[PDB]
Design an enzyme around this catalytic site. Structure first.
Site, PDB file in Angstrom:
ATOM      1  CG  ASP A 142     -68.348-112.838  79.260  1.00  0.00           C
ATOM      2  OD1 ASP A 142     -68.012-112.148  80.456  1.00  0.00           O
ATOM      3  OD2 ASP A 142     -67.416-113.265  78.787  1.00  0.00           O
ATOM      4  CE1 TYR A 200     -59.189-111.842  80.183  1.00  0.00           C
ATOM      5  CE2 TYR A 200     -61.253-113.332  79.433  1.00  0.00           C
ATOM      6  CZ  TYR A 200     -60.658-112.077  80.025  1.00  0.00           C
ATOM      7  OH  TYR A 200     -61.450-111.036  80.229  1.00  0.00           O
ATOM      8  CG  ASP A 238     -63.676-112.332  82.318  1.00  0.00           C
ATOM      9  OD1 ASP A 238     -62.771-112.288  82.945  1.00  0.00           O
ATOM     10  OD2 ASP A 238     -63.613-111.913  81.129  1.00  0.00           O
ATOM     11  CD  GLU A 241     -65.401-106.136  78.449  1.00  0.00           C
ATOM     12  OE1 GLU A 241     -66.886-105.825  78.304  1.00  0.00           O
ATOM     13  OE2 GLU A 241     -65.097-107.131  78.469  1.00  0.00           O
TER      14      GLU A 241
HETATM   15  O1  LIG Z   1     -46.763-108.112  73.217  1.00  0.00           O
HETATM   16  C1  LIG Z   1     -46.931-107.382  74.224  1.00  0.00           C
HETATM   17  C2  LIG Z   1     -47.402-107.796  75.566  1.00  0.00           C
HETATM   18  O2  LIG Z   1     -48.757-108.528  75.393  1.00  0.00           O
HETATM   19  C3  LIG Z   1     -49.137-108.980  76.576  1.00  0.00           C
HETATM   20  O3  LIG Z   1     -50.255-109.686  76.480  1.00  0.00           O
HETATM   21  C4  LIG Z   1     -51.555-108.926  76.029  1.00  0.00           C
HETATM   22  C5  LIG Z   1     -51.984-108.782  74.397  1.00  0.00           C
HETATM   23  O4  LIG Z   1     -50.809-108.417  73.664  1.00  0.00           O
HETATM   24  C6  LIG Z   1     -53.128-108.327  74.213  1.00  0.00           C
HETATM   25  O5  LIG Z   1     -53.485-108.281  72.975  1.00  0.00           O
HETATM   26  C7  LIG Z   1     -54.115-108.623  75.423  1.00  0.00           C
HETATM   27  O6  LIG Z   1     -55.399-107.565  74.781  1.00  0.00           O
HETATM   28  C8  LIG Z   1     -56.479-108.272  75.550  1.00  0.00           C
HETATM   29  C9  LIG Z   1     -56.533-107.677  76.998  1.00  0.00           C
HETATM   30  O7  LIG Z   1     -55.727-108.086  77.772  1.00  0.00           O
HETATM   31  C10 LIG Z   1     -58.182-108.113  77.532  1.00  0.00           C
HETATM   32  O8  LIG Z   1     -58.310-107.549  78.659  1.00  0.00           O
HETATM   33  C11 LIG Z   1     -59.184-107.595  76.503  1.00  0.00           C
HETATM   34  O9  LIG Z   1     -60.502-107.786  76.810  1.00  0.00           O
HETATM   35  O10 LIG Z   1     -59.091-108.065  75.339  1.00  0.00           O
HETATM   36  C12 LIG Z   1     -57.634-108.048  74.823  1.00  0.00           C
HETATM   37  C13 LIG Z   1     -57.729-108.756  73.450  1.00  0.00           C
HETATM   38  O11 LIG Z   1     -58.957-108.446  72.500  1.00  0.00           O
HETATM   39  O12 LIG Z   1     -53.896-108.343  76.613  1.00  0.00           O
HETATM   40  C14 LIG Z   1     -52.716-109.125  77.018  1.00  0.00           C
HETATM   41  C15 LIG Z   1     -52.191-108.994  78.128  1.00  0.00           C
HETATM   42  O13 LIG Z   1     -51.822-107.685  78.523  1.00  0.00           O
HETATM   43  C16 LIG Z   1     -48.228-109.901  77.211  1.00  0.00           C
HETATM   44  O14 LIG Z   1     -48.406-110.251  78.455  1.00  0.00           O
HETATM   45  C17 LIG Z   1     -46.907-109.195  77.468  1.00  0.00           C
HETATM   46  O15 LIG Z   1     -46.001-110.207  77.898  1.00  0.00           O
HETATM   47  C18 LIG Z   1     -46.192-108.679  75.919  1.00  0.00           C
HETATM   48  O16 LIG Z   1     -45.030-108.017  76.143  1.00  0.00           O
END
Ligand SMILES: OC[C@H]1O[C@@H](O[C@H]2[C@H](O)[C@@H](O)[C@H](O[C@H]3[C@H](O)[C@@H](O)[C@H](O)O[C@@H]3CO)O[C@@H]2CO)[C@H](O)[C@@H](O)[C@@H]1O
Ligand SMILES: [Ca+2]
Ligand SMILES: [Ca+2]
EC number: 3.2.1.4
Length: 605
Positions: A58, A206, A55, A424
């Site tokens: 990691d 995820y 991914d 990252e």
């Molecule tokens: O509620 C707002 C929108 O959220 C979307 O999901 C996101 C999460 O809220 C967000 O916390 C998460 O963060 C991840 C990131 O995607 C990842 O790449 C990273 O490595 O870690 C993060 C967490 O530590 O991301 C998701 C995706 O963007 C919803 O998809 C959306 O519908 C909603 O409006």
């Protein structure tokens, strides 16, 4: 001419995906610092689940983002095959897509069964070292009718469907296999409703935040494109009405963007492109306007430098995802003003990532001016002591990887491997970014580097023996040897090592009176010496069974203290292996180390 060489950037992006590979690597492997890894994936469930992509920095194989990455990469190749052809990267794109799809096939043993994860997030993240020598157990997880996962199943369906369109003309047999699999996976996703994170331990990494509704529309659309079956388009348009609205209004979500979790935004544009219905055009317009001019006084945060900052994590990944889709939409929309707005926005965001920012630095590893050198990546770092802090600089250049970048609208950034926010890297980070690059190559052009990748050379001996005189003596020689495995080209195990210390028998010394002893030896202590010929003899230390690998303080080395007592007459000055040994621990070039009988270090007599 192109402000930045988009073709070179794409060329390096394709290399990044090759560096993320797991399983048994091909003979044609371009990443010299990568070797076979995760060779026992799936063993716990009697399946061959080797292959696929790691991914991020990691070694967990997270099926949800892995599938999305594949769908996005395919999408870009479908939108701009010319960009890929002109940059000379089409074969590498196909190679990359075939790699991940071969894995999806393996992970789908039967119609309603999909393995969505190999490895445990916590166990995996606790260790910092190269993929080739992972010391922990890697559990396989799956979704089925008993515990479904519509989101991840529909996404994998979409990835296979989209990819089939790419191989259609090249390998119609392969494309057919992918379509067949995508149909089954979609039926599974549609029939057994459920969020995959409720079944597999991926919530902390995820989690399915948006649910699966968006994946049903997304999956249906892609299957429609891959099959030409109108029922799928019908399915997509039907499910579209159940997409998330925003807060208090009946307006569909427009304040985020497309990423591994939410595909709503992509469907707005895709359906608008396909049908031409005002319904989709209104949604797509509202969303892209929010990212540009704003809607109702609200607009995505922008830094003074001109960067669109959606959130703290993978800020550039979000901007790049939006940039790609804006480029696609800009082509279908007729409005001259909107077309300009969206298109120019996309070019600006991608250019920012390539170096057009207040720091005047590239955010793509190994590309442009002052790029990041220390991305948060285990194998690129090449640590041999299970420490993210040593060595100071990453030992390998992870060409093409787009970093998280500035997490706040202030253009601030520090190249620090320990900053998982700014440094990252991930497969999904490069997904929209690559597709955008292909669009830009087609429009502005650029030329790939004739000789890429460069062939890196080790930063020193990888597997060697250090020695020093432990205790000075006249009737004996007491050596303190240290076997070291600091390999990184690629990292490799040494579990069958032995070493020889040659010495010349002296006048008045009976070989039968020679004794080899030790007060500390992590390996075996021999009873006798070996006669070669004439007065040449050698002592052999056997370390077979000891797993010496670059994965921790104790793991990467074996200490061996040995005393060779010969009595009065003993003279080490005419001893081959004694040459150069002093009071400080340093590499001993005359002590030969063997790996299963094969010389790996030192020169023999
Ligand atoms: O509620 C707002 C929108 O959220 C979307 O999901 C996101 C999460 O809220 C967000 O916390 C998460 O963060 C991840 C990131 O995607 C990842 O790449 C990273 O490595 O870690 C993060 C967490 O530590 O991301 C998701 C995706 O963007 C919803 O998809 C959306 O519908 C909603 O409006
Ligand atoms: Ca979703
Ligand atoms: Ca001697």
């Amino acid at each position: 001419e192109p402000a930045f060489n988009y073709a070179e950037a794409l060329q390096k992006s394709m290399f990044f995906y090759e560096a993320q590979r797991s399983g048994k690597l091909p003979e044609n492997n371009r990443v010299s610092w990568r070797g076979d890894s995760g060779l026992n994936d799936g063993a716990d469930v009697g399946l061959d689940l080797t292959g696929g992509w790691y991914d991020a920095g990691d070694h967990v194989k997270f099926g949800f983002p892995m599938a999305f990455t594949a769908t996005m990469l395919a999408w870009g190749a479908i939108e701009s095959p010319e960009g890929y052809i002109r940059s000379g990267q089409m074969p590498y794109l196909k190679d990359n897509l075939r790699w991940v799809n071969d894995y999806f096939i393996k992970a789908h043993p039967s119609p309603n069964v999909l393995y969505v994860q190999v490895g445990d997030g916590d166990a995996d993240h606790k260790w910092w070292g190269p993929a080739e020598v992972m010391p922990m157990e890697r559990p396989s997880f799956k979704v089925d009718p008993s515990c479904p996962g519509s989101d991840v199943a529909a996404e994998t369906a979409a990835a296979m469907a989209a990819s089939s369109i790419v191989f259609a003309d090249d390998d119609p047999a392969y494309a057919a296999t992918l379509v067949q699999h995508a149909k089954q996976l979609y039926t599974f996703a549609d029939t057994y409703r459920g969020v995959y994170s409720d079944c597999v331990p991926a919530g902390a990494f995820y989690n399915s935040w948006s649910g699966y509704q968006d994946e049903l529309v997304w999956g249906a659309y892609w299957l429609y494109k891959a099959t030409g079956d109108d029922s799928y388009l019908a399915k997509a348009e039907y499910e579209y009405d159940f997409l998330s609205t925003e807060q208090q209004t009946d307006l569909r979500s427009y304040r985020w963007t497309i990423a591994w979790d939410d595909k709503s935004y992509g469907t707005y544009v895709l359906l608008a492109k396909e049908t031409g219905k005002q319904k989709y055009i209104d949604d797509a317009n509202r969303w892209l306007d929010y990212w540009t001019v704003g809607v109702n006084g609200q607009r995505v945060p922008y830094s003074p430098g001109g960067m669109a900052v959606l959130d703290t994590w993978g800020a550039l990944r979000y901007a790049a995802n939006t940039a790609f889709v804006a480029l696609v939409y800009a082509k279908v929309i007729d409005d001259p003003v909107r077309k300009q707005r969206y298109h120019d926005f996309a070019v600006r965001q991608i250019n920012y990532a390539l170096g057009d920012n207040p720091r005047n630095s590239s955010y793509v590893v190994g590309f442009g001016n002052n790029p990041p050198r220390n991305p948060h990546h285990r194998t690129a770092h090449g640590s041999w002591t299970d420490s993210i802090a040593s060595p100071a600089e990453n030992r390998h250049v992870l060409y093409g990887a787009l970093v998280g970048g500035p997490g706040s609208p202030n253009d601030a950034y520090t190249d620090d491997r320990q900053d998982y926010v700014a440094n990252e890297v991930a497969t999904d980070y490069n997904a929209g970014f690559s597709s955008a690059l292909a669009m830009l190559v087609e429009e502005y052009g650029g030329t790939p580097l004739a000789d890429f990748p460069p062939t890196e050379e080790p930063d020193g001996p990888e597997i060697f023996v250090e020695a020093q005189i432990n205790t000075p003596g006249t009737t004996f020689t007491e050596i303190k040897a240290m076997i070291r495995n600091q390999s990184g080209w690629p990292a490799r195990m040494l579990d069958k090592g032995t070493f020889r210390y040659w010495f010349t028998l002296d006048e008045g010394v009976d070989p039968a009176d020679i004794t080899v002893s030790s007060a500390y030896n992590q390996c075996a202590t021999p009873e006798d010496v070996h006669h070669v010929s004439g007065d040449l003899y050698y002592v052999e230390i056997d370390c077979t069974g000891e797993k010496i690998f670059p994965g921790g303080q104790s793991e990467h080395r074996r200490e061996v203290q040995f005393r060779i007592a010969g009595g009065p007459g003993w003279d080490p000055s005419n001893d081959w292996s004694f040459q150069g040994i002093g009071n400080e621990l340093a590499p001993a070039p005359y002590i030969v180390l063997y790996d299963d009988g094969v010389p790996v270090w030192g020169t023999a007599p």
